[PDB]
């Protein structure tokens, strides 16, 4: 264990006097405990990779042996804390040292072990009963919003011999003593799980429920299914908080996890301020999203492997919580930075630049990363179910969709949400292009719509084809001079203007537009498309023989109805009863056909 | 028959990437298979790649992880990899390495065959000329695929190539009209499991799961076993063809992942690179994958391959499409522009080509006017595209009557001929009649690709 430390070709250093060890095994170096792991091995000596300035490291210095590869530790107390790429509790570090710099080689467990928690056993398991992995044996009230169920890890089974009673147990306490065949084992409420793999699941089921989104746009037009995969572009100033905040507050998801590399502290202070401000009043009271979310971020000062592995760590945490029987949403920010980190790692290891400097296996790694999603159901007694969704941000170089990473991300993902800076300076919130953004999840949710509302799909198709018709006729109406066009073209243009100014807008800060429910969305859609339908139907009826109706007559006759259509958003569903809103729709429609009949 | 007790050595002199070196190995057996016992007890597997002196480098199928130079063990088989084959495997599902997935048993293996296979005697080959009934007008009539041939389909991300595979494996038939049926073989290549589920469901839609030899492999699985899986599937096809007198519709998917895995292995082995950094022997490897096909003397069976592949960046000069084009005869090249035009089946007819028209068609099989109809249609479509390009700038005013006729012909060609639908099987005769109706718009004089006799015989209708 007396590391025969050599120099460096950078940070990388090799050494000798190493007993039996395996590649990718964590190792501390020197009396300062600089972190690393094995890269290569040979004979008795092995090369290793350190992740810190190697200055001050002398020859022959000790190396601490470990017994695990790159791994994360998980248990009660993880929710609401802040970490980094190698799972280090920087909050606890500032609490322990009160300094403004990173102490090199922190020997601090991510979970403070001096904290007590209130544990209640299952009450169903008995002494001498046989249990396997994935099976809940107790619970702990980590926070008033989410119940942290505790279950056995995988690859472990045996007959229980002792059950700790309910009480007040710290992190180091033992609760289970399981006698496997001929051997015994110890079990606390913290567990260690390596990172470069997926915990096995019993089965994968198809996605059969929409992902709720507060914004009515992106939901009734280009939906994302719960448990799906999405790609959002990322540009300086185009607007990314507009979706992140809305997803964190207004969402049917159960837990939020935000990761990233090469970011600022500004978003961190923003979410700090959003702890009270963006609170959800499920019980009419202010509870912090901190209880419902966990943060992890890294600056570009952090080691390259920390940036590389934080993205895997996000999936590991999401897996741990989807095992509990919950629904997770992932904010995999700054994927291009991850690609650059991988390129730097390959440059360190002297691989060949397969394409544009990026390594050969980038696409394969991305595919493996996006494999971890969907709705599943895991090993256990109650047969719970959960899901995991991913939202990876992509930063193309100036919008060019040609560098390999964006092409791969477009290829693997199904639904793309478009953003624009033209619309951004057009004071349009949120910005969506409507022509490059697409979806592929309509087929899965067909039965859901057919069962619940039964009019969503036809109205949605009418909406999108009307928008496409506007896009097509824009060039013709520009060419002619915007003074000669058939009446049906006029009504299509006008309803495009109305669906623009009315249905495709929203102000978050406005109290009544903070949340738009799905039923409100489909009600607006049905009302507007039915109005357009009766409009061009009557126009086609009267255009040929006599009493040729023009839009001026329609406007002067239905001006009150146009004003009502413009102003019908002012509803405030929180206060106004929903049944009253549906009755309002009914009487508005009543006025619609009355006016259309009286026109003829 | 091998009455030699097995061996096992613990002398692991190193590990570098996916490679492992074994010193003091006694009399290495090249191209061997070994099994590895990790310290915690998990089993692993690999094949010996290189031997020199008392050293033996060995690559691991599932990937290096956790191997300890002092604790792990390795045991030696002394025989090249031989896979279990069986005729009862039809209707089953396995992973890439061949183990059961459906809680099925270890297959009772009618024989043990070489994974690398063997070549075929040249003189023991017979040319195939039987036309297959696909039910797609763009295939039957333009790029008709015959038995004993290996046409792939060049597709990109988001294209409906999976549905094309479904249709071709569903509406298979014989143009020349006892019963017939095709023993489907399919192996995934790390594709996302949604497409695997869709293929499974469509295969029950066929209603003949009893003739579906299926293999699977997902993205999250180790990358390097993708080098093995297609060879195992091809060995199964060989066994079912030349030992059981059956026809097999072998189909693959996503050869780009195979190319990537081979690239990673080559990079680990630091061989001499080539174009875009690909391995030099990728061509010979692809040859060993594809040329295992056809039908031979003394056997009524045959091998048909449809190895669809991903086409990155829609670039025809990308090495993988190029080399796949060289090694094979034909291509399809599903189009992105047509799919963005919202037309199905979106197969571009021009870049596609089939080399088996030389004997698959002609008098006595389909008709005495198939080839000249197809040649005339190709010429008319190409010139229609050219005049469309001219019209893109010149404007309709300066054109002539011929230009408008060509544009109208192109419009008819796209709206009617290509538009075929998802479940409307069509006969050869109907496609020929449709093509003749399309061609009828042009008077006889400007038809420069039809002989006089056929033109006088068939046109005036």
């Amino acid at each position: 264990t007396f590391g025969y430390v050599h120099g460096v070709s950078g940070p990388v250093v090799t050494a000798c006097d190493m007993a039996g060890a395996a590649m990718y095994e964590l190792v501390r170096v020197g009396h300062s405990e600089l972190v690393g792991e094995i890269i290569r091995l040979e004979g008795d000596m092995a090369t290793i990779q350190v992740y810190e300035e190697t200055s001050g490291v002398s020859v022959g210095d000790p190396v601490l042996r470990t017994g695990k590869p790159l791994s994360v530790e998980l248990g009660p107390g993880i929710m609401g804390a802040i970490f980094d790429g190698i799972q280090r509790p920087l909050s606890d570090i500032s609490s322990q040292t009160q300094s403004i710099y990173i102490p090199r080689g922190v020997n601090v467990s991510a979970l403070s072990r001096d904290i007590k928690w209130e544990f209640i056993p299952s009450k169903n398991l008995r002494v001498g009963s046989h249990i396997t992995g994935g099976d809940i044996y107790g619970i702990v009230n980590e926070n008033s919003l989410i119940k942290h169920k505790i279950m056995l890890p995988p690859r472990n089974r045996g007959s229980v011999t002792y059950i700790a009673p309910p009480g007040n147990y710290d992190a180091s306490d033992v609760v289970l003593e399981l006698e496997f065949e001929g051997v015994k084992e110890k079990f606390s409420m913290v567990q260690v799980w390596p990172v470069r793999q997926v915990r096995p699941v019993t089965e994968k089921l198809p996605a059969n429920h929409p992902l709720l989104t507060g914004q009515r746009v992106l939901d009734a037009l280009f939906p994302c299914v719960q448990g799906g995969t999405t790609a959002i572009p990322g540009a300086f100033g185009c607007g990314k908080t507009v979706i992140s905040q809305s997803l964190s507050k207004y969402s049917n998801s159960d837990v939020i996890i935000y990761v990233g590399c090469g970011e600022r502290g500004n978003e961190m202070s923003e979410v700090l301020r959003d702890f009270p401000e963006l609170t959800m009043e499920v019980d009419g009271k202010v509870e912090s999203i901190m209880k419902r979310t966990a943060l992890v971020a890294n600056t570009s000062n952090m080691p390259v492997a920390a940036r590389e592995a934080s993205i895997y760590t996000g999936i590991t945490l999401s897996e741990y919580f989807r095992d509990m029987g919950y629904h997770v949403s992932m904010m995999a920010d700054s994927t291009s930075r991850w690609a650059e980190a991988l390129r730097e790692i390959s440059g360190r290891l002297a691989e060949m630049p397969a394409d544009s400097g990026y390594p050969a296996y980038l696409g394969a790694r991305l595919a493996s990363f996006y494999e971890r999603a969907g709705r599943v159901k895991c090993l256990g007694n109650p047969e719970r179910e959960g899901s995991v969704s991913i939202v990876g941000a992509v930063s193309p170089p100036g919008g060019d969709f040609s560098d390999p990473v964006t092409s791969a991300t477009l290829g693997i993902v199904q639904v793309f949400w478009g953003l624009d800076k033209k619309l951004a300076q057009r004071k349009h919130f949120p910005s969506v292009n409507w022509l490059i953004s697409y979806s592929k999840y309509m087929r899965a949710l067909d039965e859901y719509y057919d069962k619940h509302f039964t009019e969503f799909v036809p109205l949605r198709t009418k909406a999108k084809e009307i928008l496409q018709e506007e896009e097509d006729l824009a060039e013709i109406v520009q060419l002619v001079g915007k003074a000669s066009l058939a009446e049906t073209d006029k009504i299509t243009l006008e309803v495009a203007k109305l669906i623009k100014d009315d249905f495709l807008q929203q102000n978050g800060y406005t109290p009544y537009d903070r949340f738009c429910p799905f039923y409100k969305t489909v009600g607006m859609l049905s009302n507007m498309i039915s109005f357009y339908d009766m409009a061009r139907r009557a126009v086609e009826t009267t255009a040929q023989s006599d009493n040729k109706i023009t839009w001026s007559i329609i406007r002067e006759h239905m001006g009150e109805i146009l004003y009502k259509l413009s102003s019908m958003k002012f509803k405030d569903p929180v206060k106004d009863g929903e049944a009253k809103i549906k009755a309002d729709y009914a009487q508005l429609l009543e006025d619609m056909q009355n006016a259309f009949r009286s026109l003829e | 028959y091998l009455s030699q007790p097995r061996l096992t050595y613990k002398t692991v002199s190193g590990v570098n990437g996916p490679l492992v070196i074994l010193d003091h190995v006694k009399f290495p057996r090249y191209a061997e298979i070994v099994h590895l016992t990790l310290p915690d007890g998990t089993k692993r597997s690999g094949q010996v790649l290189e031997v020199s002196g008392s050293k033996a480098v060995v690559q691991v199928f599932e990937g290096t992880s956790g191997i300890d130079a002092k604790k792990t063990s390795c045991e030696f088989t002394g025989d090249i990899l031989r896979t279990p084959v069986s005729e009862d495997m039809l209707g089953r599902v396995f992973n890439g390495s061949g183990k059961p997935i459906d809680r099925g048993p270890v297959v009772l293996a009618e024989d043990f065959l070489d994974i690398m296979g063997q070549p075929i005697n040249p003189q023991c080959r017979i040319y195939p000329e039987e036309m297959i009934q696909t039910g797609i007008s763009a295939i039957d009539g333009m790029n008709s695929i015959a038995r004993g041939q290996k046409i792939p389909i060049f597709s990109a991300a988001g294209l409906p190539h999976n549905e094309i595979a479904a249709q071709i494996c569903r509406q298979a038939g014989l143009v020349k009209k006892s019963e017939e049926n095709f023993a489907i073989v399919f192996a995934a290549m790390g594709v996302n499991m949604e497409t695997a589920r869709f293929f499974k469901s469509d295969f029950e839609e066929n209603g003949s799961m009893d003739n579906v030899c299926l293999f699977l492999n997902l993205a999250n699985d180790p990358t390097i076993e993708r080098i093995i899986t297609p060879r195992l599937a091809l060995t199964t096809a060989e066994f079912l063809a030349y030992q059981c007198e059956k026809h097999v519709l072998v189909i693959l998917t996503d050869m780009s992942s195979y190319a990537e895995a081979l690239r990673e292995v080559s990079a680990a082995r630091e061989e001499v690179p080539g174009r875009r950094g690909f391995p030099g022997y990728m061509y010979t490897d692809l040859a060993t994958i594809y040329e295992r096909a056809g039908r031979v003397e003394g056997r009524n069976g045959s091998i048909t391959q449809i190895p669809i592949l991903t086409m990155p960046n829609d670039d025809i000069t990308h090495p993988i499409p190029d080399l796949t084009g060289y090694i094979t005869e034909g291509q399809i090249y599903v189009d992105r522009q047509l799919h963005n035009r919202q037309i199905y089946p979106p197969i571009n007819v021009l870049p596609s080509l089939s080399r088996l028209m030389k004997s698959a068609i002609g008098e006595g099989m389909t008709r005495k006017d198939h080839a000249d109809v197809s040649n005339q249609l190709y010429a008319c479509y190409a010139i229609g595209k050219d005049v469309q390009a001219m019209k893109a700038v010149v404007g309709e005013e300066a054109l002539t009557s011929d230009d408008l006729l060509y544009l109208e012909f192109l419009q008819k060609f796209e709206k009617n001929f290509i538009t075929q639908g998802p479940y409307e099987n069509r006969t050869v005769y109907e496609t020929l009649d449709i093509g003749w109706q399309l061609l009828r718009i042009f008077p006889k004089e400007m038809l420069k690709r039809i002989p006089q006799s056929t033109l006088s015989e068939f046109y005036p209708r």
Binding site: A350, M352, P353 | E270, V272, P273
Partner: peptide, 18 residues
């Protein structure tokens, strides 16, 4: 890059002659 890598490895293996 590949050519330079090859010659660098050649120099290295020559260095470890003894």
């Amino acid at each position: 890059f590949y050519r330079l890598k090859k010659i660098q490895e050649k120099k290295k293996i020559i260095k470890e002659k003894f």
